[PDB]
């Protein structure tokens with residue numbers, strides 16, 4: 001049925017507004033991460049931003065036109081050091097998957113919008129993993145484990161693919177001469 005005049009219609013626009021702002025914030029944090037010398041984290045912020053663009057797109061497509069007023073609170077700033085930005089981002093994701101989306105989903109089910117409710121719930125799953133990544137990286141920075149580990153492992157240069165074996169990433173990639181910032185733990189998800 002039509003969304004016109006329902007609380008769900010307003011919730012969809014509210015989520016869209018928030019997701020849109022999240023996309024921008026994450027891209028800015030991505031740029032800051034690059035400046036702070038964390039390439040993997042920078043690319044993670046950028047990817048998360050792109051995924052927020054997609055959450056927003058799915059939501060936007062449910063709407064049926066017209067201007068709708070909304071009342072909501074949003075983060076008024078700010079861009080800080082990468083550790084701080086990761087913490088703030090995780091907090092945002094936390095609110096979204098623990099409070100906002102579940103509430104919106106329940107109301108959607110209440111008003112008889114099962115498909116939309118399912119989408120809200122599904123997006124919440126994505127946000128929980130978004131938070132996990134942000135919290136994990138924040139922890140790595142705080143513990144000084146971004147580029148150094150207890151036991152020898154494999155590190156990959158994101159710039160050229162060089163693989164380094166050792167307890168930590170090298171100061172300079174021997175293959176492309178780019179700085180340590182480009183290294184990440186070698187991952188194999190296939």
Ligand SMILES: [Fe+3]
Nearest residue numbers: 093126127130
């Ligand atoms: Fe997210």
Ligand SMILES: [Fe+3]
Nearest residue numbers: 157160173176
């Ligand atoms: Fe390299």
Ligand SMILES: [Zn+2]
Nearest residue numbers: 019052055127
């Ligand atoms: Zn999202």
